[PDB]
RNA sequence: UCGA
DNA sequence: TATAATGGGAGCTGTCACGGATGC
DNA sequence: GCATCCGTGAGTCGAGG
């Protein structure tokens, strides 16, 4: 899945074979998708959303 | 895919121990004087704290403030006082011929003193990546030629030759050994970390240097 | 303290392009001014140089083609963001312009991090630079889209962060 | 700088700490016009020192 | 980003004098009224306006499309100052 | 207050029969998805193409199955034949059953098919089998008429026992991507400029496609008419 | 309140001279010519 | 709507009046409803007391003072820019000894500065707050010593400025010594000057380790009192002759002069309780007979030396405790700049009585009133403790009061700022508040006073507790100190009790600050509430319990920062505490007795008490407070109503129906929106704006002065040279903009017209009037125009003109106008939004209604916050009330949680449940089942595990709710977001910190007069500071041209400047820079430095920067 | 004093 | 332009650690 | 050789009166 460190390789190796003009188009295509995706993926945060656990 | 579980995982957004507060025990807390309550916090954020835990914690939270506020002067301080020793250096030239160098240790002595064991990845690499080699390099049969800018490939590659014992140290052009005067050269200083590529003659490193060390000034705790 | 400098509350530019910033209209036409007044001559807006700063004085005299003509000036050119404290030489970087509405300047989402910026009411000054030389120089070497990689460890210091690295997780 | 995480290349530093060494003080003058504790720039007595090697002092 | 600016970063030994380069054929462009371009007329970079598209008043664009094309040669002592300036005085008057 | 608007231009780029660029601007504040979000789900949905619902291969009972002397198994056979794009000419005409039977060492393409009649085969390079030295493939496959994305377990049909029922692909739309920019006309500031991609598979072609699009879309409107 | 001897102020870069070919070639043929 | 409050916890006493600790102190201080001879030695008259008799006619003496009433009430002291404040007379007598004779006069003192109501004040027609000051209070104190580890140092502190701080240590060579004004010196010769023998110290002292041999000194034995005083004056005054007259002076004025050296009421009470002793006076010693008698440093010396041995009962002392720290009120600092003046005075009057004829003196004739007047004014005005006061909303200017200040005069300076002074000590327990300080560099040094906390008459800040016996809490509430409590073990406010008695078998509380689990049978004390441990902006925030302190300090800080909207409601969540705020403050207006409302108007209320006495209370309408926030009443009552004793009849500003109310309630939804919410930005609905919510109106005051000049007088006139009719179209005759009027950026507002100054015009000038043939006029125009990126609708015009009734301005200026332009301010894109929980963003994106986000009956929400600010910020109140804002949504009805004794979950849960059956059976009724959407809804939550499987929609959508979590669509779509979104009514506020205030932009403008560079400053047209980081940002960069353009054609460059921007507007490029003016001002400041700066070339030969124009 |  | 008059008087305080001169 | 006093430094930009 993809993360904060596995995105960071993805734009240093971008950078390095494709050059800076191609990174910055593919970072603001990152920027672009995540935020559409993370608009409508259903995250927020409910007082339930905090999970005291049985073990605890 | 509960959000705060993601939020800390994916890296957006907390940390285990935020979390912690939020779903666990809030924890143990600090008086004063440093010293620690033998009672900790048993209620999270979430069950929502007693009067006196909380006065409790305002402790820790008061210091901590205190402590950064305090902080962010002597880290800009600093930061000045590097400025200033560094800024009449700038890469004055391509090379400055020098057949001095710095060897960088793939290896560490152990706290046991049992023997030597691998430094961690980052550090070679802080150590390593972008320098240019003093001298010829032979492992796992590639050859590193005397010039080379050592790629992220290069020092990965030396990590495994390290690991499998062909080489415990690197020859390097560094700063500490350059002969320019008044600056750094080409390939002392090597690549310009910003484009991954050797660094353009009249780049002003000192500055770079200085303001590299001083940035994180106010994180260091 | 400089001339051609002005300073405004940031706000998220989402729809911005990596070499790109939301300047406000008139933040824009005071920085520009020169320029501005040189362009209302170059057209029929007005007849010199005086006159058209005196039409720029009051508010209520101000029209459409001056704005249109603070549009044509500048084209191709870039002003400098700048957040306090300034701790690297990334504290600074070059943005082409983009006029818009309202009085707030807009940055762009992946540049925060270089510039340990946030929305809770930070603000930032903005700077023309003026010669041909001071422009080349933040074109190339000063834009944002040019300097990807921290200049200290060598990593990508523009990459996705929060609702980016959420979404594409997700 | 490790501790607290933050990846910082050793070149900068080495930099700073070549700041730091580019200064010397003379335990003898030789035949220069120095003196006993005289503290002066490394690179200036290095050239006054190949000055004077050349010149047979 | 600035388009092509890898090929740039490619031309010369140092990023400052790829700036130096650009920002002095600015110059030229502007004190000559851009009659100097070596930029066919369909090279010509444009500025979308109101009426149609016109040329781009931005010199510094202009520079470094010219320099992209290899039309453009750069160095040091090529010719002296004077020389240049009256020489290019005479082939497109200000 | 008093409000003019002027018509907005209406653009087209097209590569081919397969990729076309459509932007509508200057729109109303908020129109520019008003038009597109209907429009996109249309053209992925309702859009009337074939698709290749069932497949017959001799001595083949199931999907999963491996066919002798053919080096493509049933799957990836079934794979390919989802991608073939077969033109109805006939208006009339609902459905088609192709026969194909070849053998020995030889590379079946989509040209091998017996032709029917006003049945036009578009991509008849599109590779089906590499058969080799005794291997023998001989299969009939369904086309039929219809619209959207049906799984092969919802349509379910089955000509005879050991016919294999195929994700139906009737869609010629491969996708549709809209993207609304901020654009101004004179000092208005808000106005919509919206920019349509649509990706076909050549049998419909984009500008077809969204002309059909709008079509339906008007002629639901007409709905609201006869209480 | 000089130019900085780094960046677009380095001596090794500054001196640097641009001349279309157009113009070199007028100038080199005055150069032949003297 | 019905308002529901939680919590078992009864309070028994009420919250102080909250403003006590400034009217009370400064009541104590006057004393001006006191007659004079009832007064006590407190305050100005123990000023008096302190400062007379004044002798060497010979002799002055106070009989008594008296305080005549204000010459102008308090809003005409706005009005004028007068200070509220009364005569200050005092009856005096003048006596010469000889001559017997004896002159008594009343004198005229000039004016004390009157505390309002509120506890404010008004200097100069501007309102202030003097903040209460924290130090370490007077008394004895003894520390380890850092260097020495079983050594210790005795310290005698008296009061600030009232004498010396003195230091006992014994010396490594065992000899112990004192230290005065930085002088070591043996306490051993002080002794014997005391009186002490020998014999007396053996004796007393003896006991301890033998260590009294460092105490012994033949030499200081072998000589009488006498001698060993000019030995001591001596030691103390090298060079100054040791007459026997003049080291008795000395030596009385530094230790028993009560005229110079004084300890605190609570310097001489800690004293005691310290050593164990008695004081008869504040001072050390006595001067009794002739010969200096001992008070303080035996008993001083006898605790040290039993501390050093080890003797049980002696102890160090914390000096962070709250009983060794004391608050200085307003009383106390106005008291000592009091005494100063008057002191001054003295010597004035001391100066005066030497000279002139010494038959006929009056009182009058001796004293200058002058030096007083200017200690006073001072001490209101340039002081640091006397602060602007901050009226945004009532809120601020109440926890403006209540602010305790560790800085300032007699207070430390930043730089002696430490942790430890910082820090939350284990005695801020219910008084001072631990989460309201600053943050940033001013942290843990101004601080808040507790909801119930007092101050006492010692200085000290006492908290109440509730007096338990045999496990029985009692109704009696008992004020310790910190000193007292630690003496106690105190449960707390929340154990359980059935009936008075405590329920619990084991019972949590303190003993000296540590927690402890203890019986009933073992509890002393109980607290009075969780309400007493907080201020009173931290008392305001609802689930506080819940919120992590760090971002509970933003939110209780920007509480303060609040603008009161137009249309400003109450939470919906409420604390219980904000019907006080309201009423302490003085910002709603109530009935004095029952009765009838005869009259109900906009500018006045009219009420009929029983009494049968009509009274009229008049309302503030639009007034501009001290921050442009603008304060009016609106009466809430009708002709006719019946009215009780303490009923609401008028709502202040930032007031709902007698509750606080800093903001709005909106609808509020909990996601990520397309980045427009991205790092703590805010997208909110432009319904927002259409029903007027965060609209507030703002009032801007300006200022224009004609005044008399050597060229002749400037005059307000609507005659202004070279203006069209379209320009002076909204100036009336005289030439001041019309009420009603709208102003825009550029427009004039008062017309004036200047003398020109001597014109010797150029060629051109000349040439150009030939052409034109038109005589250059006399007068200019100087009228005061709208700055850029201001205006708003005219309100007020005030004139003042010299030569009319009542009016006298400062000498030269013929008059002076005032314009007051107010606005009325929507939200915008730039403006800061907060809720109470610290949660703090930027509206970043403003979307028509479509575009919102929406409830499937089609109910948009109005702000869209993103959840990312959540987990890192740890404040989850603010979930927690938007929950229970969700239910009281749909329930119609607000709710009270007292922090900490709040709605626990089940409750909020059962809540949720009544509001899930009005939120769906009405659909249900209506004939609509359930959406295709929410079913797609309801199996992506079932995947998540947020709903049981199996169960019917209905009930699902019922279990989702109870999370507070609904089914939400996006309106750009129609799709339903994938997952359940959090939505509910959430509390939130605009800040005063808004875009409109604070965008700037400058081409060119006004330079410093040296430098010649930029002024700064938005107001003076000012250019953007480019430091020295940013010069390093640009070198780092290595842009070489960028950089120099900055540091000259853009600053300090004059001809460069010129040429650069004649460049620009003739269309041609910029000229290379030249030498910046600012260095040619170091060179010259280094030259009057007797430094010659030679700029060379690379020949070593001179270049002449000044073009010559320096050089002969 | 406040903001970042 | 003339009795005679003759040594002042506010300091004022919760840091802090470095370096480089000054005395047992 | 080792206490001691003295002088000098102790984050940026912005707001308001
Ligand atoms: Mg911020
Ligand atoms: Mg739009
Ligand atoms: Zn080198």
């Known amino acids: 899945p993809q993360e904060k460190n596995s995105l960071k390789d993805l734009v240093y190796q971008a950078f390095l074979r494709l050059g800076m003009e191609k990174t910055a188009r593919l970072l603001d295509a990152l920027k672009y998708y995540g935020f559409t995706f993370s608009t409508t993926s259903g995250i927020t945060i409910g007082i339930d959303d905090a999970v005291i656990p049985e073990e605890k | 895919f509960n959000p705060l579980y993601v939020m800390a995982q994916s890296g957006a957004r907390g940390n285990p121990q935020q979390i912690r507060q939020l779903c666990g025990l809030r924890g143990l807390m600090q008086k004063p004087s440093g010293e620690t309550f033998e009672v900790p916090v048993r209620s999270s954020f979430r069950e929502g704290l007693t009067v006196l835990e909380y006065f409790i914690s305002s402790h820790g939270a008061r210091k901590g403030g205190a402590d950064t506020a305090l902080r962010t002067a002597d880290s800009g301080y600093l930061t000045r006082k590097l400025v200033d020793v560094t800024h009449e250096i700038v890469v004055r030239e391509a090379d400055c011929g020098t057949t001095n160098y710095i060897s960088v240790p793939l290896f560490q002595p152990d706290e046991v003193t049992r023997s030597l064991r691998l430094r961690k990845r980052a550090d070679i690499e802080a150590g390593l990546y972008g320098r240019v080699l003093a001298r010829e390099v032979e492992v796992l049969g590639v050859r590193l030629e005397e010039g080379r800018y050592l790629s992220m490939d290069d020092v990965h590659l030396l990590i495994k030759a390290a690991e499998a014992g062909e080489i415990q140290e690197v020859p390097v052009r560094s700063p500490l050994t350059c002969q320019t005067r008044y600056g750094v050269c080409q390939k002392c200083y090597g690549y310009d970390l910003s484009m991954a590529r050797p660094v353009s003659i009249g780049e002003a490193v000192g500055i770079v240097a200085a303001q590299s060390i001083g940035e994180p000034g106010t994180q260091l705790t | 303290r400089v001339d051609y400098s002005g300073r405004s509350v940031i706000v998220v530019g989402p729809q911005l392009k990596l070499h790109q910033c ?140 929060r609702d980016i690295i959420l979404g594409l997780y997700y | 700088y490790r501790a607290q995480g933050v990846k910082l290349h050793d070149k900068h530093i080495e930099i700073v700490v070549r700041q730091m060494m580019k200064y010397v003080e003379v335990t003898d003058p030789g035949d220069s016009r120095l003196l006993e504790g005289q503290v002066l720039e490394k690179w200036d007595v290095e050239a006054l020192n190949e000055r004077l090697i050349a010149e047979g002092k | 980003a600035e388009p092509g600016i890898d090929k740039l970063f490619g031309m010369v030994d140092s990023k400052y004098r790829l ?49 992209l094309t290899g039309r453009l040669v750069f160095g040091e002592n090529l010719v002296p100052e004077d020389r240049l300036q009256k020489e290019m005085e005479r082939l497109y008057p200000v | 207050l008093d409000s003019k608007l002027k018509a907005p231009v209406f653009t087209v780029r097209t590569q081919g029969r397969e990729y076309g660029e459509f932007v509508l601007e200057p729109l109303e504040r908020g129109f520019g998805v008003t038009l597109g979000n209907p429009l996109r789900r249309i053209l992925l949905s309702s859009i009337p193409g074939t698709a290749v619902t069932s497949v017959y291969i001799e001595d ?24 073939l794009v077969v033109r109805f000419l006939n208006p009339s005409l609902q459905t088609v059953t192709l026969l194909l039977k070849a053998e020995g060492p030889k590379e079946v393409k989509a040209r091998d098919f017996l032709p029917v009649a006003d049945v036009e085969i578009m991509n008849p390079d599109l590779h089906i089998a590499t058969l080799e030295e005794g291997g023998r493939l001989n299969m009939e496959v369904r086309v039929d008429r ?70 339906i879309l008007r002629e639901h409107l007409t709905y609201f008419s006869n209480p | 309140g000089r130019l900085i001897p780094a960046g677009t102020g380095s001596d090794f870069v500054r001196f640097t001279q641009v001349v279309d070919q157009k113009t070199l070639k007028a100038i080199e043929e005055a150069r032949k010519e003297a | 709507m019905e308002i529901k409050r939680f919590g078992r916890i009864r309070e028994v ?61 308090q809003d005409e002291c706005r009005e004028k820019d007068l200070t509220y404040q009364a005569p200050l007379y005092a009856r005096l007598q003048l006596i010469h000894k000889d001559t017997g004779l004896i002159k008594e006069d009343e004198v005229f003192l000039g004016h004390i500065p009157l505390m309002t109501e509120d506890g404010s004040f008004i200097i100069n027609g501007a309102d202030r707050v003097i903040v209460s000051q924290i130090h370490r209070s007077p008394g004895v104190y003894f520390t380890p010593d850092p260097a020495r580890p079983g050594r210790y140092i005795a310290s005698i502190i008296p009061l600030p400025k009232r004498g010396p701080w003195i230091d006992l240590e014994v010396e490594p060579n065992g000899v112990v010594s004192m230290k005065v004004n930085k002088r070591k010196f043996p306490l051993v010769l002080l002794l014997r000057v005391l009186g002490y023998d020998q014999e007396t110290l053996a004796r007393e002292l003896g006991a301890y380790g033998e260590l009294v041999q460092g105490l012994m000194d033949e030499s200081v034995f072998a000589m009488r009192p006498e001698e060993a005083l000019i030995r001591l004056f001596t030691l103390l005054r090298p060079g100054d002759p040791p007459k026997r007259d003049k080291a008795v002076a000395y030596v009385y004025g530094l230790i028993a002069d009560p005229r110079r050296y004084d300890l605190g009421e609570a310097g001489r009470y800690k004293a005691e309780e310290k050593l164990g002793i008695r004081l008869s006076g504040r001072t050390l010693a006595r001067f009794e007979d002739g010969e200096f008698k001992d008070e303080v ?270 249309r400003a409601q109450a939470p919906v969540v409420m604390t219980g505490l904000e019907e006080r705020v309201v009423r302490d403050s003085l910002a709603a207006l109530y009935a004095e007795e029952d009765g009838e409302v005869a009259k109900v108007d906009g500018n006045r209320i009219v009420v009929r008490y029983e009494d049968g006495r009509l009274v009229e209370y008049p309302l503030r309408r639009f007034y501009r407070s001290n921050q442009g926030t603008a304060l009016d009443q609106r009466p809430r009552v009708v002709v006719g109503q019946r009215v009780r004793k303490g009923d609401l009849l008028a709502d202040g500003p930032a007031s709902e129906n007698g509750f606080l109310a800093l903001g709005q309630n909106v609808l509020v939804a909990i996601m990520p929106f397309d980045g427009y919410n991205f790092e703590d930005a805010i997208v909110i609905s432009e319904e927002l704006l259409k029903r007027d919510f965060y609209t507030s109106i703002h009032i801007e005051r300006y200022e224009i002065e004609a005044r008399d000049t050597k060229l002749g007088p400037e005059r307000i006139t609507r005659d202004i040279p070279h203006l069209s009719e379209a320009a002076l179209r909204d100036l009336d005759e005289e030439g001041v903009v019309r009420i009603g009027a709208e102003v825009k950026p550029g427009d004039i507002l008062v017309g004036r017209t200047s003398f020109k100054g001597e014109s010797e015009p150029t060629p051109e000038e000349r040439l150009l009037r030939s052409i ?93 916050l993103n959840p990312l600010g959540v987990p890192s910020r740890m404040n989850l109140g603010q979930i927690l009330e938007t929950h229970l804002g969700l239910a009281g949504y749909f329930l119609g009805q607000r709710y009270i949680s007292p922090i900490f004794d709040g709605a626990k979950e089940p409750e909020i849960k059962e809540l949720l449940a009544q509001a899930f059956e009005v939120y769906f059976g009405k659909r249900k009724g209506e004939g609509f089942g359930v959406d295709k959407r929410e079913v797609e809804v309801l199996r992506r939550a079932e995947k998540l595990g947020l709903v049981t499987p199996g169960k019917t929609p209905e009930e699902q959508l019922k279990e989702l709710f109870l999370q507070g979590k609904v089914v939400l669509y996006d309106g750009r779509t129609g799709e339903p977001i994938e997952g359940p979104i959090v939505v509910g009514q959430m509390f939130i506020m605009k800040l005063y910190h808004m875009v409109e205030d604070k965008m700037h932009a400058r081409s060119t403008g006004p330079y410093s007069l040296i430098t010649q560079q930029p002024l700064g400053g938005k107001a003076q047209f000012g250019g953007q500071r480019f430091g020295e980081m940013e010069v390093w940002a640009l070198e780092a960069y290595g842009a070489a041209h960028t950089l120099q353009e900055m540091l000259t054609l853009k ?62």
């Open chain 3, 22 to 161: 939301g300047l406000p209209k008139r933040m824009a036409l005071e920085l520009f001014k020169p320029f501005l007044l040189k362009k209302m001559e170059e057209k029929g807006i007005a007849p010199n140089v005086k006159a058209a700063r005196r039409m720029l004085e009051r508010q209520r005299d101000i029209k459409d083609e001056v704005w249109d003509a603070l549009e044509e000036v500048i084209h191709g050119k870039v002003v400098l963001l700048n957040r306090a404290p300034t701790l690297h030489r990334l504290g600074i970087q070059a943005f082409q312009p983009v006029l818009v509405e309202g009085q707030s300047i807009q940055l762009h989402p992946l540049v925060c991090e270089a510039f340990n910026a946030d929305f809770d009411g930070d603000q930032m000054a903005v700077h023309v630079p003026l010669s041909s030389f001071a422009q080349a120089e933040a074109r190339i070497q000063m834009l944002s889209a040019h300097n990807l990689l921290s200049p200290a460890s060598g990593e990508p210091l523009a990459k996705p962060s």
């Open chain 5, 19 to 67: 700036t130096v380069v650009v920002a002095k054929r600015a110059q030229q462009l502007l004190r000559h009224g851009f009659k100097n371009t070596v930029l066919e007329p369909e090279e010509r970079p444009k500025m979308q306006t109101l009426e149609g598209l016109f040329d781009d008043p931005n010199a510094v664009t202009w520079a470094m499309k010219e320099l």
């Open chain 6, 60 to 83: 083949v009972l199931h999907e999963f199955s491996t066919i002798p002397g053919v080096k493509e198994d049933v799957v990836e056979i079934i794979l390919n034949l989802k991608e």
């Open chain 6, 146 to 215: 219809g619209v959207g994305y049906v799984p092969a377990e919802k349509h379910g049909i089955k000509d005879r026992i050991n016919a294999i029922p195929v994700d139906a692909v009737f869609s010629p739309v491969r996708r549709v991507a809209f993207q609304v920019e901020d654009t101004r006309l004179g000092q208005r500031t808000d106005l919509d400029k919206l920019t349509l991609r649509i990706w076909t598979d050549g049998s419909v072609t984009p500008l077809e496609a969204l002309n059909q699009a709008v079509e």
């Open chain 8, 13 to 73: 006493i009420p919250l102080p009046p909250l403003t006590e600790i400034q009217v009370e102190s400064y009541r104590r201080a006057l004393q001006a409803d006191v007659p004079p001879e009832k007064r006590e030695n407190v305050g100005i008259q123990a000023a008096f007391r302190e400062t007379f008799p004044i002798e060497e006619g010979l002799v002055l003496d106070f009989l008594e003072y008296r305080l005549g009433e204000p010459p102008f009430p």
């Open chain 8, 297 to 566: 440093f035996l008993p001083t010396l006898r605790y040290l030396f039993a501390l050093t041995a080890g003797v049980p009962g002696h102890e160090v002392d914390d000096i962070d405790h709250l009983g060794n720290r004391r608050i200085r009120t307003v009383g106390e600092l106005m008291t000592d700049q009091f005494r100063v003046g008057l002191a001054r005075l003295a010597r004035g009057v001391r100066e005066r009585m030497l000279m002139g004829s010494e038959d006929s003196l009056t009182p009058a004739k001796l004293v200058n009133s002058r030096p007083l007047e200017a200690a006073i004014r001072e001490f209101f005005s340039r002081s640091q403790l006397s602060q602007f006061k901050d009226e945004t909303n009532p809120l601020s200017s109440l926890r403006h009061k209540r602010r305790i200040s560790a800085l300032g005069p007699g207070g430390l300076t930043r730089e002696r700022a430490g942790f430890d002074v910082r820090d939350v000590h284990r005695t801020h327990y219910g008084r001072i508040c631990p989460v309201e300080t600053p943050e940033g560099a001013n942290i843990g040094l101004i601080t808040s006073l507790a909801a119930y906390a007092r101050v006492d008459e010692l200085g000290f800040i006492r908290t109440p507790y509730r007096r338990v016996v045999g496990g029985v809490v009692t109704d009696e509430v008992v004020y310790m100190t910190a000193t007292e409590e630690d003496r106690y073990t105190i449960a707390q406010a929340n154990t359980p009790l059935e009936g008075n008695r405590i329920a619990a078998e084991r019972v949590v509380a303190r003993r000296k600050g540590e927690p402890v689990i203890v019986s009933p049978e073992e509890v002393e004390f109980m607290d009075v509430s969780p309400k007493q441990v907080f201020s009173v902006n931290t008392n305001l925030i609802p689930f506080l319990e819940h919120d992590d302190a760090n971002r509970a300090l933003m939110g209780s800080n920007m509480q303060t920062q609040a603008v009161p909207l137009i």
């Open chain 8, 772 to 864: 034109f043939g038109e005589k250059a006029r006399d007068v200019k125009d100087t009228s005061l125009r709208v700055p850029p990126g201001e205006g708003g609708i005219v309100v007020r015009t005030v004139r003042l003109r010299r030569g009319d009734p009542g009016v006298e301005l400062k000498p030269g200026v013929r008059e002076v106008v005032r314009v007051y332009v107010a606005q009325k301010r929507k939200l915008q894109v730039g403006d800061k939004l907060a809720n109470r929980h610290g949660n703090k963003g930027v509206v970043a994106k403003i979307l028509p209604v479509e575009d919102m986000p929406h409830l499937p009956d089609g109910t948009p929400v109005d702000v869209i």
């Open chain 8, 1051 to 1112: 600053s300090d460059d004059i001809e460069g400047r010129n040429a650069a921007y004649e460049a620009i507007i003739k269309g041609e490029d910029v000229p290379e820079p030249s030498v910046p003016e600012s260095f040619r001002v170091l060179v010259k400041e280094l030259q009057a430095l007797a430094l010659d700066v030679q700029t060379l070339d690379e020949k070593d030969n001179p270049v002449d920067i000044f073009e010559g124009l320096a050089s002969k």
